Structure 1
Amino acid sequence: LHSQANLMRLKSDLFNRSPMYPGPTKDDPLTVTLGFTLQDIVKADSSTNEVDLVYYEQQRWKLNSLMWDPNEYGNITDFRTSAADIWTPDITAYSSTRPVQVLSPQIAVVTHDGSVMFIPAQRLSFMCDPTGVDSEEGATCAVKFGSWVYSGFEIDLKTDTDQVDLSSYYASSKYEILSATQTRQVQHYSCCPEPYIDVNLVVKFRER
């Protein structure tokens, strides 16, 4: 009754009484940490050169305007909110061939220090030539993820590790993973001074 009431006031205080977050700027840049858990390569189509992945995409960011003291809110350390109610980063695959499909409830975890955890399970079709998938060496494909409309001066993309998490990879998949990495890259365009950041998902795989 008290625990339940304190949360209704907390969400209210952050979401109603406080004017919300309009996004990162040059003066107030934002670090977004990114990491992948690869669950299944579902299909590799050699007549269109599309491959279908199911993965979990972990997204982590921190905000002052989502900080609070648990002492003023009944020891409440964390809460759940719909991703629609808050700002989320516009991380996008740069070479998908169909719109991403979301497999999970679009819900994020907000902790008292202002950090936000958002992990949507997704199915992506993307550009990939599976030539060699039927051999010892397998095939190698790559896809880039990054912000659609922010430079590296507004959203800094970062990984916690270069190793894609394969500890939940489906053991009875048509395809087995020889290796899977996630590398931060800095890209410039000749028009412009800003750096642009993406994370390169490289997967090497073969028929099992």
Structure 2
Amino acid sequence: KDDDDKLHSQANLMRLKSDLFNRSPMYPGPTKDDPLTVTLGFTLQDIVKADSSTNEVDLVYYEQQRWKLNSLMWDPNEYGNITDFRTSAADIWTPDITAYSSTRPVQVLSPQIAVVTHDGSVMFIPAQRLSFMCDPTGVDSEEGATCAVKFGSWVYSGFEIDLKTDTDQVDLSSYYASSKYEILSATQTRQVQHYSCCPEPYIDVNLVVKFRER
């Protein structure tokens, strides 16, 4: 029965995914009538490089994203008590969380796979290398340099996508201990932006990093 249990668990998961993905149309993304709140958090692993000839700095971090869709809900009892599953991020809608002052395309360092839970909640944690606009002047001093970069939806205003953080402290517990740069402070703060282009406000999380040469 126990290998049949294994076969049944696979059948159940295959069925769940078919039901969620093949027998319901793809979620069209958030709208003003159906807005979404994405929870964003950063785990900073390394400041790899600080280029004073171009004022670009390169970070490596894990970006934790979480949201919840009614359309991704199921009753575990209908599917052999499955409460969550992993799936390619290509299979589901994902928010267009973008750095606002990048100078190169982000490079993805991890597999793009999300965890979907039966309450319709999704957790997706892409590791990234980012080059962004930053003047490292002062990095070779006790006080160090300070740079900042905003992350938010590119195409969705606050009326479609809102953001939140669970804390305003960037997680430094995994920061590389032999980095060329030591972290003096790293914060992540929700902001409401008004851009002259657009009558609607855009929400971002402002990552502010203060750092110096070790």
**1:42 and 2:20 aligned:** no
Q: 2:115 & 2:191 partners in 1: Cα distance?
A: 28
Q: 1:75 & 1:115 partners in 2: Cα distance?
A: 17
Q: 1:72 & 1:192 partners in 2: Cα distance?
A: 46
Match of 1:77 in 2: 83
Q: Give the Å deviation of 1:18.
A: 1.4
Q: Deviations over 1:77-134 (max 9, x none)?
A: 1001111111100010000010000000110000000000000000000000111101
Aligned sequence identity (%): 100
Q: Which runs of 5+ in 1 are unaligned?
A: none
Change (3 A) 1:20 1:207: same
Give secondary structure in 1 for the equivalent of 2:158: coil
Q: 1:199 & 1:35 partners in 2: Cα distance?
A: 9
Change (3 A) 1:190 1:131: closer
Count of matched residue positions in the alignment of Structure 1 and Structure 2: 208
Q: Give the Å deviation of 1:194.
A: 2.0
Q: 1:202 & 1:79 partners in 2: Cα distance?
A: 34
* Larger deviation, residues 79-88 vs 118-127: 79-88
Q: Give the Å deviation of 1:189.
A: 3.3
Q: Give the Å deviation of 1:158.
A: 1.0
Q: 1:121 & 1:194 partners in 2: Cα distance?
A: 30
Q: Deviations over 1:35-61 (max 9, x none)?
A: 000000000011111100000001100
- 8 Å Cα contact 1:20-1:65 kept in structure 2: no
Q: Deviations over 1:163-190 (max 9, x none)?
A: 0000000001000100000011111235
TM-score, length basis structure 1: 0.98
- 8 Å Cα contact 1:38-1:168 kept in structure 2: yes
State which of 79, 93, 96 in structure 2 corresponds to 1:87: 93
Q: Which runs of 5+ in 2 are unaligned?
A: 1-6
TM-score, length basis structure 2: 0.95
Q: Deviations over 1:16-42 (max 9, x none)?
A: 111220000010000111000000000
Match of 1:108 in 2: 114
- 8 Å Cα contact 1:37-1:57 kept in structure 2: yes
Q: Give the Å deviation of 1:150.
A: 0.6
